[PDB]
Amino acid sequence: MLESKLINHIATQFLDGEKDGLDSQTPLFELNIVDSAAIFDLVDFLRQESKVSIGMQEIHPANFATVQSMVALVQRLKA
């Protein structure tokens, strides 16, 4: 269940553990939850938790805009 591990991870890493308003559809960059410089700290969590290697062509902003985008990526990158 990828959504649960990302919603949880994002709150502790970037919201100091406050999961109050975060969900799979909240825009992470428009809200400065995830900045320019924490983009790979997220890709690094998706390589360990999901166990799939992320490519350069797929480090697109649309894939990481939301949790629903990142989960769709791992489903996509799995088959």
């Binding site: 975060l22 960059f29 400065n32 900045d35 320019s36 410089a37 790979f40 480090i59 902003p61």
Partner: protein
């Protein structure tokens, strides 16, 4: 040749079949850009936009935007670049300050403008041919192009900066302001015909002045970096190779992402000839690695506020193994004179800390719709001169902040935060250096202690660009002030105590 728009005409006359500007969709020869410029000149006339009037460019960079700029310059029309990702409310404040008579934007963002305070300002759509407002649908049949008397110190464009009150401040820049910098850069770095410039910075930051206007000044090519490619550091560095980029200009943070994840130090980009950085301290550990991989590249630290563009520059030689402090900012640039001032107004001795003061041709006309700048410009940047004459940057004393090169007034953010119904008082400060810098909000809550960091970020997102939204918040019952209301800056001790407490567990 004392006017900006005359520079590309000179290059067009020399190099008509040479590639002038490149984006994702199109790649325009100088002749094709000329034709495009003439369409926008005809458009602006057909709309009755006259000499002196302001227009907002609220759209992502493209060849059309470059053509718009040249067209507006030819008509003495002052163009005003606005962050396409900026919220309508901030666009509102800028439209009011400039009194723009025209907004150029995508069709997507017309909808937000209908409910805005600039619903009555004329708008044209740049992207979607299906819009009635599509710029090409404006009938240019009866348009007639006038002949104008434009002086080199007439206002050319306005670049808005963060404002201490919440209203952005417009740096009003003349033809002479831009050309002093452009000519200085072209002579110092010997930009040549047919070189390829990368335009990484958005058009509303003055780094794009070099990327675009130096390229059109020497008959070279400007390659516009799209946001989709700017976001994969591995794609940024592949961008350099595919377009055979030879001049690069960015804040250090961009170069560091390309080093960390773009293979910039291992997959050597050997077409690079000049590698300029500006806007912030380039961590010397990382500059050391960059200089070792690109040992034969012209590599330079450029300095200055938007109010002056680059007023000081330093050619980077070697990086001493033992160096801990950032490289100097150097000596005066762009035809200016530079010195460090004591508060008494006198010139500092070597070693004395003082405020950088700039006098010369890149000094702005002044803030738009505000009284003209007279005399030397006090920058607010504290500096110290080394025995060798080069200046070193020390930081600021005022409330201007920097996060990864982005200029942020504490008061702009505080104003958005204080407007929240539950926030009583607010202080903003940056904690951490470089890529670890974080924007903190220190607040006083009216009731309870229940303030959602996400609710605070949505509230900020309605007023501020994303990089101005607070990363972290700290709620306490009182803000520490000196006897006359100045925030004690001991909040940094309070924040450091919070962060350390979390590491302890």
């Amino acid at each position: 040749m004392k006017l900006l728009h005359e520079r590309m005409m000179h290059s067009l006359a020399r190099y008509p079949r040479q590639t002038a500007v490149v984006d994702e969709q199109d790649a325009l020869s100088y002749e094709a850009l000329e034709l495009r410029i003439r369409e926008f000149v005809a458009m602006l006339c057909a709309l009755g936009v006259g000499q002196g009037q302001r227009i907002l460019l609220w759209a992502h960079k493209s060849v059309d935007l470059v053509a718009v700029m040249q067209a507006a310059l030819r008509l003495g029309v002052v163009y005003v670049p606005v962050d396409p990702l900026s919220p309508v409310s901030r666009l509102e404040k800028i439209a009011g300050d400039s009194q723009a008579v025209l907004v150029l934007c995508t069709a997507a963002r017309l909808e937000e403008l209908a409910g805005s305070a600039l619903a009555q300002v004329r708008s044209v759509v740049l992207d979607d041919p299906a819009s009635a407002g599509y710029w090409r649908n404006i009938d240019t049949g009866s348009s007639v192009v006038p002949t104008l008397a434009i002086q080199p110190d007439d206002l050319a464009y306005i670049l808005y900066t963060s404002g201490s009150t919440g209203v952005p401040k417009g740096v009003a820049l003349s033809h002479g302001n831009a050309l002093a910098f452009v000519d200085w850069a072209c002579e110092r770095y010997c930009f040549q015909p047919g070189e390829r410039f990368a335009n990484h910075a958005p058009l509303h930051f003055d780094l794009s002045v070099l990327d675009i206007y130096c390229a059109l000044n020497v008959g070279a090519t400007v390659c516009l970096v799209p946001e989709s490619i700017a976001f994969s550091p591995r794609l940024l560095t592949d961008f350099i190779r595919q377009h055979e980029i030879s001049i690069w200009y960015s804040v250090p943070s961009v170069l560091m992402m390309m080093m960390q994840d773009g293979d910039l130090l291992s997959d050597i980009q050997d077409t690079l000839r000049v590698l300029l950085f500006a806007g912030e301290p380039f961590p010397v550990k990382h500059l050391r690695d960059l200089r070792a991989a690109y040992a034969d590249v012209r590599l330079a630290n450029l300095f200055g506020p938007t109010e002056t563009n680059v007023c000081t520059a330093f050619e980077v030689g070697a990086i001493d193994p033992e160096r801990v402090l950032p490289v100097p900012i150097g000596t005066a640039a762009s035809g200016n004179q530079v010195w460090a001032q004591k508060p008494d107004g006198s010139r500092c001795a070597v070693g004395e800390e003082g405020e950088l003061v700039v006098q010369g041709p890149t000094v702005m006309l002044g803030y738009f719709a505000k009284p003209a700048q007279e005399g030397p410009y006090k920058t607010g940047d504290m500096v110290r001169q080394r025995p060798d004459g080069n200046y070193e940057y020390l930081g600021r004393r005022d409330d201007m902040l920097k996060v990864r090169g982005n200029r942020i007034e504490r008061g702009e953010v505080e104003a958005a935060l204080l407007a929240h119904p539950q926030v009583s008082e607010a202080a903003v400060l940056v904690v951490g250096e470089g890529m670890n810098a974080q924007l903190w909000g220190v607040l006083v809550a009216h009731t309870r202690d229940a303030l959602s960091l996400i609710d605070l970020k949505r509230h900020c997102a309605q007023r501020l660009p994303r990089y101005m939204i607070i990363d972290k918040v700290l709620c306490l019952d009182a803000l520490p002030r000196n006897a006359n209301g100045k925030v004690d800056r001991f909040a940094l001790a309070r924040q450091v105590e919070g962060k350390l407490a979390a590491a302890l567990e």
